[PDB]
Design a protein around this ligand. Sequence first.
Ligand SMILES: *[C@@H]1O[C@H](CO)[C@@H](O)[C@H](O)[C@H]1NC(C)=O
Ligand SMILES: *[C@@H]1O[C@H](CO)[C@@H](O)[C@H](O)[C@H]1NC(C)=O
Ligand SMILES: *[C@@H]1O[C@H](CO)[C@@H](O)[C@H](O)[C@H]1NC(C)=O
Ligand SMILES: *[C@@H]1O[C@H](CO)[C@@H](O)[C@H](O)[C@H]1NC(C)=O
Ligand SMILES: *[C@@H]1O[C@H](CO)[C@@H](O)[C@H](O)[C@H]1NC(C)=O
Ligand SMILES: *[C@@H]1O[C@H](CO)[C@@H](O)[C@H](O)[C@H]1NC(C)=O
Lengths: 596, 99
Amino acid sequence: STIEEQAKTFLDKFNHEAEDLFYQSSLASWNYNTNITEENVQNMNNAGDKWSAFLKEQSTLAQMYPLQEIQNLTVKLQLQALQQNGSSVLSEDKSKRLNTILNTMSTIYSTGKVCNPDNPQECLLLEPGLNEIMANSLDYNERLWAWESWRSEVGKQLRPLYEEYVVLKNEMARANHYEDYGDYWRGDYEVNGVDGYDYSRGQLIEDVEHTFEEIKPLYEHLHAYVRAKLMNAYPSYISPIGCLPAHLLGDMWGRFWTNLYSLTVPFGQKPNIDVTDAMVDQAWDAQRIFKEAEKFFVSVGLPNMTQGFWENSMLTDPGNVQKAVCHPTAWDLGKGDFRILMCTKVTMDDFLTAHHEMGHIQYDMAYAAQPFLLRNGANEGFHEAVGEIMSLSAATPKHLKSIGLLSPDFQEDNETEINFLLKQALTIVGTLPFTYMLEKWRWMVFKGEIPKDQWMKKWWEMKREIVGVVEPVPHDETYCDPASLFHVSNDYSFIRYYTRTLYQFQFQEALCQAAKHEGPLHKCDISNSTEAGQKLFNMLRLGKSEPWTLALENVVGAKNMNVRPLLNYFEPLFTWLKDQNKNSFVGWSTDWSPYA
Amino acid sequence: GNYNYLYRLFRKSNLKPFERDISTEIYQAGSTPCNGVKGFNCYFPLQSYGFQPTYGVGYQPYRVVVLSFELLHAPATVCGPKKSTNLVKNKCVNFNFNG
Ligand SMILES: *[C@@H]1O[C@H](CO)[C@@H](O)[C@H](O)[C@H]1NC(C)=O
Ligand SMILES: *[C@@H]1O[C@H](CO)[C@@H](O)[C@H](O)[C@H]1NC(C)=O
Ligand SMILES: *[C@@H]1O[C@H](CO)[C@@H](O)[C@H](O)[C@H]1NC(C)=O
Ligand SMILES: *[C@@H]1O[C@H](CO)[C@@H](O)[C@H](O)[C@H]1NC(C)=O
Ligand SMILES: *[C@@H]1O[C@H](CO)[C@@H](O)[C@H](O)[C@H]1NC(C)=O
Ligand SMILES: *[C@@H]1O[C@H](CO)[C@@H](O)[C@H](O)[C@H]1NC(C)=O
């Protein structure tokens, strides 16, 4: 009869039919990932085409129910999610051109091979050929050669493609009643219709700048300390007053600074907290690793893994004959089927990754009661943040002592906490200006603030101003230096890492306050606390049914993203860096003083 | 995927106790007549459970048998088994033979 009842029957047939088609598509993707064979590729492509065609037909049918005659918040949220045209609003020729451009960028990035001129008999791919060179070499000209040659080949191939990509995506976004593609990406954090908890697309950029303004002193001190250490490592290249050379940051693009921990260690003489040898001595299998992770999650009060998880997951590499993707991925296949695909080794990194992916599985299990189209995180930040909090808690020395992996007579003094916090800052704090600068540059490109002939002149100007990283040699407009990264070349949002980083420490402070921890925030373990698990599970059970602002109120008691938990986490390290930077100069100059 | 098992997802009114509906008539959710075609606002009532072995415990198939016991004015004939205590002779015992 009424429009709302029609929409409810439609979203009762949709959830079941989409759940079935989803499960089938996800199972085909799983069978491709654990078994790389051509029939599995064909089955994956067929299932994906059926899934996409079904989503197109339901999007075509969902728009005939007007939004303003529906008052129920959940029904309006599902109808708002379904009624998005996506690429369907664009013409078929331009949609096909956009899909072709995305596929050819994927092939160029995946199969991009670059090696030294005059020695072309063999070449190295990005993973792991160039990654290992960027992460382990100490030679200036070798890193300069790899960086400039890979950005030359990839940028000169991708620059016309990216020029077409920005125009097509802007055309689709303006066809979808958005200002630009940046507004389309920022619409994930848009909350409309809830009194008090409304969030605007324009408020996101202002909040990011407001948080980054408080990020900036800690990043300036960390940049000065890393600059001094790299000056020690490389005597003449780095200037005391200037920016860091681009090819010396330990990774291909500057995404993480975690590969500079060896060069920039405060106290090399003091030991590390590596527990790998203890697991080797006690013969810890990957099954034992996942059982210890399950013990951690039952200690906080969350549900334990299902029998189908243990039966159907692949937690060891299958062998030479059967090929599988080595990347750890948590799969919520649907219908209560939860799996982890990880080639787990006996390392600390794999143990923390197992905790992170089981946190993903716990998040997926929590919203299983919700309808199918609301089975996601409230935003893109929460889903990664709930795994990163498990990665934080599992990495603590108290957790390692509790599970027996660390010696009970290990001395926890200030120096090990300082160097551990510096490593966590290089991994976590260092990615924040790069993420913010990349997203702000992409937003200005989509908005039209920067003309196509001035993309790179502004970009390096941004990198000097924000990241404090100078180009080795000037680049003209024939280069496409941003698109060498995986996320930007393959049409992925990048602000999820920034939001994940802030939500991680906000959740960490909230759970540690819930668990009544009485020490430093980085010394906090959330095991054995039922109330902290209850506070987590109240937000976890909601899924996408409620606004992310209300979920953040449910956890931390605040209506907005906050930067103070991050600064509280690194406060001992912040005081130590302020003490160590008395002789040196904090901050950088945007001039060409080191090298150009 | 086993698609031999089906359930009714839509009906105009709730079922009465111990009622069976096996009708396959197209459900009318709107004012517009369905006319036998599964178009806009007109859905097919019976949907299938795609039972696969790798499902979760809350989605796995469960066979349910419901036993309904009624006492009516007719003679009750479905009785439970009555045991037979080993007969003892030549002693003063309390005997119960067929009531
Ligand atoms: C992987 O695919 C091959 C292809 O023939 C098949 O023989 C094998 O049984 C598969 N293994 C698994 C674990 O699915
Ligand atoms: C919205 O719809 C759901 C089912 O679709 C229902 O359970 C819920 O109570 C409704 N909310 C309101 C406020 O009526
Ligand atoms: C989707 O596109 C159709 C026509 O292409 C348009 O009528 C409809 O309003 C669009 N939906 C949204 C949410 O913009
Ligand atoms: C999960 O916990 C319940 C209750 O503690 C237990 O009965 C069940 O066996 C556990 N599951 C597994 C796979 O051990
Ligand atoms: C650690 O503590 C000792 C004794 O309190 C002190 O001598 C030392 O300077 C401290 N180091 C740092 C980095 O705070
Ligand atoms: C948490 O509970 C487990 C199980 O009883 C116990 O072994 C562990 O020691 C506890 N954690 C702490 C820090 O005591």
